[PDB]
Amino acid sequence: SMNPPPPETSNPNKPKRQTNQLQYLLRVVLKTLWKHQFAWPFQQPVDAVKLNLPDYYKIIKTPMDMGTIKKRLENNYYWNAQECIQDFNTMFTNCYIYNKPGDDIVLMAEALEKLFLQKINELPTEE
Numbered sequence: 001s002m003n004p005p006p007p008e009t010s011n012p013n014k015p016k017r018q019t020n021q022l023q024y025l026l027r028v029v030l031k032t033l034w035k036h037q038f039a040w041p042f043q044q045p046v047d048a049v050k051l052n053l054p055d056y057y058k059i060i061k062t063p064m065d066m067g068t069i070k071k072r073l074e075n076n077y078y079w080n081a082q083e084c085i086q087d088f089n090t091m092f093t094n095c096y097i098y099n100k101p102g103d104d105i106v107l108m109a110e111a112l113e114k115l116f117l118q119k120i121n122e123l124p125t126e127e
């Protein structure tokens with residue numbers, strides 16, 4: 001069971017903005033999670049062939065990862081902060097949907113999500 005194409009990261013016809021909230025999502029939120037010791041399983045799409053998870057992309061129909069989020073932010077792909085926040089939440093939820101409680105990967109996601117939520121709590125007001 002093969003891998004799907006990754007999520008879209010480029011679309012010239014999509015309206016997009018560079019806002020102070022989206023800048024915070026890159027400079028604070030993404031950067032903080034990316035450097036974390038538990039980030040690496042989330043820094044690129046799940047390679048379900050290499051990990052031998054032939055059911056992964058049958059169960060996870062809206063895949064997301066921080067490599068995709070990083071590219072979207074670096075490309076100014078988003079219209080607003082909530083679109084990007086949704087991507088992070090999809091990533092975390094997908095982890096909890098696919099895996100067992102207490103699994104290492106879940107503990108890793110939980111550590112990243114705690115930091116995510118702390119940073120989002122201080123999202124600046126839109127300028």
Ligand SMILES: Cc1cnc(Nc2ccc(OCCN3CCCC3)cc2)nc1Nc1ccc(Cl)c(NS(=O)(=O)C(C)(C)C)c1
Binds near residue numbers: 041042094095104105
């Ligand atoms: C983002 C993400 C979400 N869900 C999972 N689920 C998962 C991964 C592998 C699993 O193996 C099961 C045993 N195999 C299956 C057949 C036999 C062998 C089981 C479940 N993976 C993720 N990314 C990831 C990326 C790189 C790696 Cl190396 C890992 N591996 S890991 O074990 O979870 C680790 C980070 C080392 C704790 C996960």
